[PDB]
Design a protein around this nucleic acid. Structure first.
Ligand SMILES: [Zn+2]
Lengths: 108, 122, 433
DNA sequence: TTTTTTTTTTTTTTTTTTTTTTTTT
């Protein structure tokens, strides 16, 4: 079937407890298997990372993950690289908002 | 005769006026189309390469014909192709498939689909 | 009384105190179910801005009544969902005048803010980017005759006139007036004795380096009592009408873009390049196909010379023009490429410079590649498609032995800037929401 | 209930209209 996976920012986490989302952000810090990410939202998000992940050496990242029931934590399923070693976060914020407004195109 | 930016969901919601006709999306013929997605599986045949492909809105098969080692799982790609039906299944028949330039293209693409949909629809 | 920002469909007992910042001409139409008239006004107060519109009978009642920069008590009108495709404002709502609508002019102007200006000096305009809002003040030097043209875009006649504006910068710029404001222009008092004109919200075009055009929403004042204008009045009368000026340039298209962005359907629907005078345009399109056969020709090895050469009797490559022969020919592109967008598909031709980036290889490099395997040569071409470009084009008539085809030539092709093409699309979309 | 943001301008280079992914799941 494949359930749609919403593109979200940090403020939408509450709306998807227990659900698989997709989120983009700039890597702030990496502390063991935890990643701290800044969202288009301007809000930060704690991501629990898979054993194999070289996120450390990358600037912007796209995580597919499941939202955890405490607040804004996150069990990473998959992870996608971008930037350099130049994602436009404002562009991203707008796409999030616009995608939310067109469920006929981005959802069930 | 056109090249329509679309989401996999729109591909999936396109109507086929039954028999075996042209597809119709938003009251317009849906021939050639393009989209950006992540490769999730790659099955290789003698005749074709089949990719399982997913863009957060749905999943579809795109098979491209042999007559690609840069492309791997968990990678964004630009897909150009024709929508096809076999035996109640929908898949993209593709010629061109390229690793996405930068992530901004993925973003640009969602907007292009919105914009296109809006212009056929008002 | 309500602040403008306070208005909503949920409250019906309200009155606003607002000044008219701009007013549309009277618009007429016809179609299938309808055919009528309307106009609109923009309104401003402490809290913000709102659009109001009158239809049919409301025009007769209020069009004469409402005048720019004047302040009014408006009351008992509908608050509607804004149609942002037809407006510059960000407001979620707009106002529609119904027959019950009360408008009476005010004697106090002090509560209501006055239109502020962020002036750009004529010499600074080259730093403002095209298709953007801007404020300009300066002396009117002269003005063009009124020209009437059917826009290929719409297919309905348009009144047009051009003014020459000048400031201390010693540079002059063209500005286009449209519609009724254009016609009635010499009606206005003091128009011939070098008045100061002040413009709010004007479009910057790049025709002739930089040029100006008005929007529906744009505004002009003739000799306003504002400190900036007295400076120009004083300046011009003392040494301004003594020195000479600069035209900017890089007949009539003030404010226009020398190659407006178009879609493939627009290019064909507007019959661009089908008359004697060439047309120019920009198109975002995707390369879908490059024609393999005759991609490149064998060209003359003379410095500066590009004419096609042919094998002579000593099996050398002969040029006619430069009357000589070389063992080795140069290879130049004569690219034939099919490009598509969501509105259609179109054929473009490209030459050596632009075709090289389209393939990532000089025609010489391609040739050699074909000499080793067709497979790697068609991979190069196959790899060149499925890529997106901004294309700058001309369209002209060619005369192939009596018969006559339009051709589309690439003058520049730039790869799409996704981030920036993205923000454009955001703007475009928000207008439907 | 109901309608739009308008115009305008130049190379040297082959032939003259091009085949886009072709068939398996
Ligand atoms: Zn020569």
């Amino acid at each position: 079937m494949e359930k749609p996976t919403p593109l979200i920012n940090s403020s939408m986490l509450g709306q998807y407890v227990g659900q698989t989302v997709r989120i983009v952000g700039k890597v702030h810090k990496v502390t063991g298997n935890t990643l701290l990410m800044q969202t288009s939202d301007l809000g930060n998000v704690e991501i629990a990372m898979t054993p194999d992940s070289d996120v450390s050496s990358s600037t912007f990242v796209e995580v597919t993950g499941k939202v955890s029931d405490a607040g804004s934590s996150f069990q990473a399923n998959q992870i996608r690289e971008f930037t350099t070693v130049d994602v436009d976060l404002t562009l991203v914020e707008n796409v999030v908002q616009i995608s939310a407004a067109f469920p006929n195109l981005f959802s069930d | 005769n056109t090249l329509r930016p679309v989401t996999i969901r729109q591909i999936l919601n396109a109507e086929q006026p039954h028999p075996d006709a042209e597809f119709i999306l938003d009251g317009a013929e849906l021939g050639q189309l393009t989209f950006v997605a992540v490769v999730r599986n790659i099955s290789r045949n003698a005749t074709n390469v089949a990719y399982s492909v997913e863009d957060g809105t749905g999943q579809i098969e795109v098979r491209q014909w042999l007559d690609a080692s840069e492309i791997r799982n968990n990678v964004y790609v630009r897909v150009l192709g024709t929508l096809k039906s076999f035996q109640n299944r929908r898949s993209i028949s593709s010629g061109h498939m390229r690793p996405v330039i930068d992530y901004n293209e993925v973003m640009f693409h969602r907007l292009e689909a919105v914009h296109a949909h809006l212009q056929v629809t008002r | 009384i309500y602040p403008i920002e306070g208005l909503s469909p949920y409250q019906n007992r309200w009155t606003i105190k607002a000044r008219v910042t701009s007013k549309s001409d009277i618009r007429h139409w016809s179609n299938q179910r309808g055919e009528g008239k309307l106009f609109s006004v923009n309104l401003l107060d402490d809290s913000g801005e709102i659009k109001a519109t009158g239809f049919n009978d409301a025009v007769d009642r209020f069009y004469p009544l409402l005048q720019e920069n004047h302040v009014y008590l408006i009351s008992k009108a509908r608050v509607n969902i804004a149609k942002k495709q037809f407006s510059n404002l960000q407001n979620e709502y707009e106002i529609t005048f119904e027959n019950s609508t009360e408008i009476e002019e005010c004697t106090d102007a002090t509560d209501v803010p006055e239109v502020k200006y962020e002036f750009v000096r004529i010499n600074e305009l080259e730093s403002v980017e095209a298709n953007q809002q801007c404020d300009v003040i300066g002396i009117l030097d002269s003005y063009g005759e009124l020209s009437e043209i059917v826009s290929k875009a719409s297919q309905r006649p348009v009144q047009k006139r051009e003014l020459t504006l000048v400031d201390q910068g010693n540079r002059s710029v063209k500005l286009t007036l449209w519609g009724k404001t254009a016609e009635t222009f010499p009606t206005n008092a003091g128009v011939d004795e070098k008045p100061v004109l002040a413009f709010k919200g004007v479009k910057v075009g790049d025709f002739g380096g930089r040029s100006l055009s008005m929007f529906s929403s744009s505004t002009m004042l003739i000799n306003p009592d504002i400190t900036e204008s007295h400076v120009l009045r004083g300046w011009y009368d003392n040494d301004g009408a003594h020195a000479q000026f600069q035209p900017y340039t890089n007949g009539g298209g003030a404010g226009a873009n020398m190659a407006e962005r178009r879609t493939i359907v627009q290019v064909k629907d507007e019959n661009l390049g089908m008359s004697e005078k060439p047309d120019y345009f920009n198109v975002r399109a995707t390369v879908v196909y490059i024609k393999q056969e005759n991609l490149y020709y064998t060209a003359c090895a003379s410095e500066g010379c590009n004419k096609k050469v042919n094998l002579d009797h000593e099996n050398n490559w002969r040029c006619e023009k430069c009357d000589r022969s070389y063992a080795t020919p140069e290879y130049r592109y004569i690219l034939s490429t099919n490009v598509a967008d969501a509105t259609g598909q179109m054929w473009l031709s490209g030459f050596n410079e632009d075709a090289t980036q389209l393939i990532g290889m000089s025609a010489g490099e391609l040739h050699k590649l074909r000499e080793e395997s067709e497979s790697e040569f068609s991979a190069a071409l196959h790899r060149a498609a499925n890529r997106m470009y901004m294309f700058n084009c001309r369209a002209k008539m060619d005369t192939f032995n009596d018969t006559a085809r339009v051709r589309y030539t690439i003058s520049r092709a730039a790869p799409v800037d996704f981030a920036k093409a993205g923000m454009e699309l955001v703007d475009a979309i928000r207008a439907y929401m």
